[PDB]
Design a protein around this ligand. Structure first.
Ligand SMILES: [Ca+2]
Ligand SMILES: [Ca+2]
Ligand code: NA
Length: 1082
């Protein structure tokens, strides 16, 4: 329908930057600095009215066109300049491309009776400057109008006409021709020939293409004859620009952000043409374009004043949702003049078809004060926030174009440059300064360090500011022209030290928003302490500026400037400053998170604390839970409320189970006191789940102690009641190691795990080698396959021992113990063979319990446990077991996965309310099944299960975890009705007998933990399920990981697709949700 802005960000005209934070890495580069007193080829020979830039990119070079008069708008003479650049930073001198033109003596207008042209030069005015033809030729164009006096309008449709000339590869120009005559002008009374007279056929064709292109005729309407047939839309909407939407329609913009749409390539336009809703814009043009990443951007003055120059982003070219700074400085206007107004203005970029700059970035031309010509480079994809702290070595960059993480403001007479290890700021400009800004992650506690050298100590100024997102500086450091390094404390200053020229000082600044103070160190010694002179919530920028900010102009400054500033073309004596080795860091609890912040998720803990009573308090009360979460949890978001809420709930729930004991932390299963528990209410049944879930907690002390408590907490030895439940704990301890990388913890636990393994091996094997367990001792009383006081070979304990054996073999190799590797690897091969040969039921095609004589002939959830440890072979015959996931007669039920196949005649025949494992949904089991299903989907060539199937079962697990309208994790539930089968009984509340977030992290998001330095992800989310999601703040192998997905690029503004970050630096990328492997990125 129409271009519009729905962002809530407004620009405040009382500040020159609008209080807008800039996008990352914007370089503002001055191209032309007007100087009447010292005219030179490089400044257009002293002309001080310079305005209306045009931009193209052709044959590896930028072409920058602008117009100029000696001092006053519409006061002749008037001409058009051209400049070129390979890189956008270093430009050739302005070259006159269309020169002053004689208005014929005797010219008149109806609006000026009695006047005639005599010895009068025309006024130039163009809204379009460039066309690249189909044959790859570059045409530049301009137009001549007539101003009979100061007040006359050259764009009245009574002008002379429009001219063109070819720009050639070699830098030369072809001859000037007229392409359009205003009424009354023709070949016989104009001073350049008509374009059709050229003997260059291909040039003539190139010009003819301009005339046949309605998008170009739309940009001739202001100067062309009124009502001229060749103009598609005849109303004088101003400074037309357009771009192509993703569906191929064309969206237009004009001054005041008037906007329309064309469905026929620009021949006709939708009425009524109205201002783009929500856009703040006035008279100084708005530029819109498609970017190289497929998204869209507008650049404009978001204001009734011509400042700042800002950028708004859109994923689709219609809805714009952001507002940030491009250019926020205002050079003072040095030379007065007719219609010159203050600030950066008249933005204009490259038309579609007129070239794509090789760096992929967004380049926009504009003037400042209609006096100085500028360009800005904006990196694409356009990033709002910094995802990592600074740690910058400038010697690694050959030129400023490589300072992707620095915002740079570089006037011709105050340029920014590199000099080996140094970022250098120079300043000889009495009216401007050099300025660099390092945007960093918004921080409450901040350290900033850098090396600093000044080329002098008796002149110049350097201000160093620490800024929030609204340009509030909380503190300022200054190198003064009387040789003092000082800090601003309020109205007064702290003089910290005298500084000398040519000396390198190591500066460290420590800022705390909560304590509201800054401490400054030089060469390791504290030299300054002060309160912030302005309070801020967080600090996001460090700014280095070779001057004081000017308050002029304000919203109260008069519009017109008739004076020149004193010494308008003079110089200041040169001041230089150099910085190197810029580092920032934060001790904020969530500083390790690159995109997500805990403050946006703390509402979950708060809601959970308020929604119901706290029945039982262990080591971490509800009152401490949010703080604990902020320290310990990876952060997650997605667009589906229930998944996100469950993520946070299950962490909040798990945390209740951390218990203080005289031997350190323990982890409970039931919060209520159980009569069969070991010391400190410990129950061994779900330890494997406890470790798999808890391995993601960032502070290792909890899980270190929980494990040591089980194995050493009973007079230095293992808890006695570990013998009451089957164990996959050696597998779980290796799984922990694969997340945290802590070799010494794992190596030190090896003997304890061997002792555990050997006990089970001694007590629980049949003569044939298979393990037996009573179903009660798997924690699964009243199963169909069964075994209260039976010695059946269940695929529970056999797979677990397979897993423990395999894990202990691997721990042997990591120990350097090759004997142990073989001893346990042999046990693993032995058990794998026994499970495959003896527990695979060939009638059912399913792993099942082996009773004394024959199979139990019941498909149970326990039959999927072999895949929890990747036990089975890749052969096709085992696949078919997984079909029962999608069969209502198998495991598929309305609330998720049953513990026994629904077709079985003994399904749920042993009563209710007393913990029965003959069919009801048990999260303990669902978690096993889902872990196994993920392994199967990741590690096996497999055609039975899609992502939709896995996602759907995770969704049902989510939906099942509610009770009385609130998140709830209990013991077990009805597969058809969803009823949690202990009802409102206290015992079930916050049950810790399963995983959830381990499944979210390793299956759904798909982080696959490994022993090596390679990162492997493979999300099992279908294509088009979620437009975005992110898992952040993950502590994996001593590094902080982020995994994110952003289909349209607008959730995180770091590009489209699937991305992995390591400590906030991108490590890999894919266009789709699919397997992504980053080799040796750790
Ligand atoms: Ca152009
Ligand atoms: Ca200066
Ligand atoms: Na702001």
């Amino acid at each position: 329908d129409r271009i519009h802005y729905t962002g809530k960000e407004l620009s405040n005209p009382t500040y020159h930057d609008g209080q807008l934070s800039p996008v990352v890495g914007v370089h503002n580069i001055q191209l032309v600095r007007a100087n009447r007193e010292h005219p030179e080829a490089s400044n257009g020979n002293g002309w001080t009215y310079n305005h209306q830039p045009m931009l193209a990119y052709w044959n590896g070079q930028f072409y920058y066109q602008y117009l100029a008069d000696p001092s006053d708008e519409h006061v002749p003479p008037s001409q058009t300049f051209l400049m070129t650049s390979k890189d956008g930073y270093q430009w050739t001198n302005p070259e006159i491309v269309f020169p002053p033109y004689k208005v014929p003596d005797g010219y008149t207008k109806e609006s000026r009776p009695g006047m005639q042209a005599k010895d009068l030069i025309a006024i130039m005015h163009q809204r379009v400057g460039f066309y690249v033809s189909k044959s790859g030729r570059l045409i530049t164009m301009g137009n001549y109008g007539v101003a009979l006096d100061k007040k006359d309008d050259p764009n009245d449709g009574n002008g002379i006409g429009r001219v063109v000339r070819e720009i050639k590869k070699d830098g030369s120009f072809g001859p000037i021709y007229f392409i359009y005559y205003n009424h009354g002008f023709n070949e016989k009374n104009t001073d350049y020939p008509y374009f059709k007279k050229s003997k260059d056929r291909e040039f003539v064709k190139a010009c003819q293409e301009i005339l046949d292109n309605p998008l170009y005729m739309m940009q001739w309407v202001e100067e062309a004859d009124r009502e001229d047939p060749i103009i598609p839309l005849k109303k004088g909407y101003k400074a037309f620009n357009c771009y192509t939407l993703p569906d191929g329609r064309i969206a237009s913009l004009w001054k005041h952000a008037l906007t329309s749409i064309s469905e026929d390539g620009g021949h006709t336009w939708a009425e009524p043409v109205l201002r783009a809703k929500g856009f703040v814009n006035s008279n100084a043009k708005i530029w819109g374009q498609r970017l190289s990443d497929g998204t869209y951007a507008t650049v404009y003055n978001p204001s009734e004043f011509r400042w700042p120059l800002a950028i708004s982003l859109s994923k689709d070219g219609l809805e714009y949702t952001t507002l940030n700074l491009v250019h926020g400085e205002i050079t003072p206007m040095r030379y007065g003049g007719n219609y010159k107004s203050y600030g950066p203005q008249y933005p204009r970029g490259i038309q579609e078809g007129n070239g794509v700059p090789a760096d992929g970035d967004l380049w926009v031309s504009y003037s400042v004060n209609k006096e100085d010509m500028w360009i800005s480079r904006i990196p694409v994809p356009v990033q709002i926030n910094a995802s990592a702290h600074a740690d910058d070595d400038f010697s690694k960059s050959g030129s400023i174009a490589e300072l992707t993480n620095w915002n740079i403001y570089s006037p011709v007479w105050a340029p920014v440059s590199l000099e080996g290890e140094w970022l250098k700021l120079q300043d000889k400009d009495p009216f401007d300064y050099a300025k660099v800004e390092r945007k960093i992650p918004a921080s409450k506690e901040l350290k900033v360090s850098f090396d600093l050298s000044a080329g002098q100590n008796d002149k110049g100024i350097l201000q160093i500011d620490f800024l929030d997102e609204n340009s509030i500086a909380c503190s300022r450091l200054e190198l003064t022209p009387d040789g003092i390094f000082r800090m601003k404390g309020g109205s007064r200053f702290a003089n910290m030290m005298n500084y000398e020229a040519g000396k390198t000082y190591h500066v460290e600044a420590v800022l705390s928003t909560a304590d509201r103070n800054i401490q400054v160190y030089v060469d390791g010694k504290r030299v300054g302490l002060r309160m912030f002179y302005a309070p801020v919530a967080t600090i996001e920028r460090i700014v280095f500026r070779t001057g004081e900010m000017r308050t002029f102009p304000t919203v109260d400054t008069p519009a017109d400037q008739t004076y020149d500033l004193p010494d308008a073309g003079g110089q200041e004596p040169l001041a230089e400053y150099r910085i190197a080795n810029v580092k920032t860091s934060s001790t904020d609890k969530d500083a390790s998170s690159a995109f997500l912040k805990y403050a946006d998720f703390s509402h979950y803990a708060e809601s959970f604390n308020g929604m119901e009573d706290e029945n039982i308090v262990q080591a971490i009360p509800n009152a401490k839970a949010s703080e604990w979460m902020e320290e310990n949890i990876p952060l997650f978001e997605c667009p589906q409320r229930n998944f996100e809420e469950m993520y946070y709930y299950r962490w909040w729930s798990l945390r209740k189970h951390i218990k203080e004991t005289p031997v350190g932390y323990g982890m409970t299963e039931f919060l209520v006191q159980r009569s069969y528990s070991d010391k400190y209410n410990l129950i061994a049944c779900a330890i494997g789940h406890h470790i798999y879930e808890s391995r993601w907690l960032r502070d290792p002390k909890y899980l270190d102690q929980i494990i040591h408590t089980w194995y050493r907490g009973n007079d230095g030895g293992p808890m006695k009641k570990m013998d009451k439940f089957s164990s996959w704990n050696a597998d779980a301890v290796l799984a922990r190691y694969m997340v945290d990388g802590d070799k010494d913890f794992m190596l030190d636990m090896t003997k304890d795990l061997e002792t555990e393994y050997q006990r089970w091996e001694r007590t629980n094997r049949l003569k044939n080698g298979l393990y037996w367990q009573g179903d009660v001792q798997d924690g699964m009383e009243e199963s169909i396959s069964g075994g209260r006081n039976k010695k059946y070979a269940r695929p529970t304990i056999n797979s677990y021992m397979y897993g423990n054996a395999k894990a202990l073999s691997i721990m042997g190799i990591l120990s350097g113990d090759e004997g142990m590797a073989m001893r346990y690897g042999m046990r693993a091969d032995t058990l794998k063979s026994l499970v495959e040969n003896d527990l695979w039921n060939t009638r059912h095609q399913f792993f099942e319990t082996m009773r004394t004589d024959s199979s139990a002939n019941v498909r149970e959830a326990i039959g999927y446990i072999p895949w929890y440890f990747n036990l089975p072979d890749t052969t096709k015959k085992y696949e078919v077991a997984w079909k029962e996931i999608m069969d209502e007669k198998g495991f598929s039920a309305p609330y998720g996965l049953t513990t026994a196949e629904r077709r079985h005649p003994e399904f749920r025949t042993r009563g209710v309310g007393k913990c029965e494992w003959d069919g009801a949904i048990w999260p303990f089991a669902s978690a096993q099944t889902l872990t196994a299903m993920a392994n199967f989907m990741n590690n096996y060539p497999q055609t039975v299960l899609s992502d939709s199937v896995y996602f759907r079962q995770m969704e049902l697990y989510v939906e099942s975890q509610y009770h009385r309208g609130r998140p709830y994790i209990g013991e077990y539930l009805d597969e058809v009705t969803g009823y949690w089968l202990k009802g409102d009984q206290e015992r079930s509340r916050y049950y810790n007998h399963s995983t959830f977030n381990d499944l979210m992290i390793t299956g759904l998001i798909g982080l696959r933990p490994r022993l090596d330095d390679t990162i492997e992800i493979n999300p099992l989310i279908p294509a088009d399920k979620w437009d975005w999601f992110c898992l952040d703040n993950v502590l994996y192998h001593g590094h902080n990981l982020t995994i994110l997905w952003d289909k349209n690029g607008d959730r995180y503004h770091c590009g489209k697709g699937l991305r992995i970050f390591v400590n906030g630096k991108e490590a890999g990328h894919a266009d789709t949700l699919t397997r992504l492997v980053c080799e040796n990125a750790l």
